[PDB]
């Protein structure tokens, strides 16, 4: 009755792909990035 368990909403752990279940992840699927823009 293996589960993937879950994360604690603790970014520290999430960032490492760490869950409470049978498996862990590689990391949290990076979604790209946002840089602040330059003014006119």
């Amino acid at each position: 009755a293996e589960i993937g368990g879950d994360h604690g909403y603790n970014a520290t752990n999430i960032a490492a792909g760490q869950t409470s279940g049978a498996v862990t992840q590689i990391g949290p699927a990076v979604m790209g990035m946002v840089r602040r823009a330059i003014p006119n």
């Binding site: 790209g32 990035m33 840089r35 823009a37 330059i38």
Partner: protein
């Protein structure tokens, strides 16, 4: 947006290249041409940082290369026995005579139809 109607085709052309399989090329597709500007795609993560450095990096020389050369070329041409070279070349290159031909389109290869040839010739004129 003054040339937006032109841009419509240019955007298409660019996209046709994006949709093309001319990939896995280490070499630039640059034979003889324009100043090279390089950015990532990456959902436009930083084209603007590169653009500003490129713009001001270009501002530094201030196109002095082109600027000095054109001014130089003119200053050269402005001299005696220099214009003669230029003018003779131009004269030999572009020839006019009494009621004669000038550069002209010559459709001597297979064409879709004579009608198109006529259309092209009218456009050339």
């Amino acid at each position: 947006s003054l040339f937006a109607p032109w841009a419509k085709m240019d955007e298409r052309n660019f996209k046709d290249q994006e949709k093309e399989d001319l990939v896995s090329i280490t070499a630039p597709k640059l034979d003889d041409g324009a100043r090279e500007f390089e950015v990532s795609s990456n959902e436009a993560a930083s084209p603007y940082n590169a653009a500003f450095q490129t713009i001001f990096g270009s501002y530094e020389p201030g196109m002095k290369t082109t600027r000095e050369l054109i001014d130089t070329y003119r200053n050269l041409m402005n001299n005696y026995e220099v214009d003669n070279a230029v003018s003779e070349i131009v004269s030999d290159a572009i020839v006019y005579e009494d009621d004669t031909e000038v550069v002209a389109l010559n459709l001597d290869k297979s064409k879709f139809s004579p009608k198109i040839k006529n259309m092209m010739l009218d456009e050339f004129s």
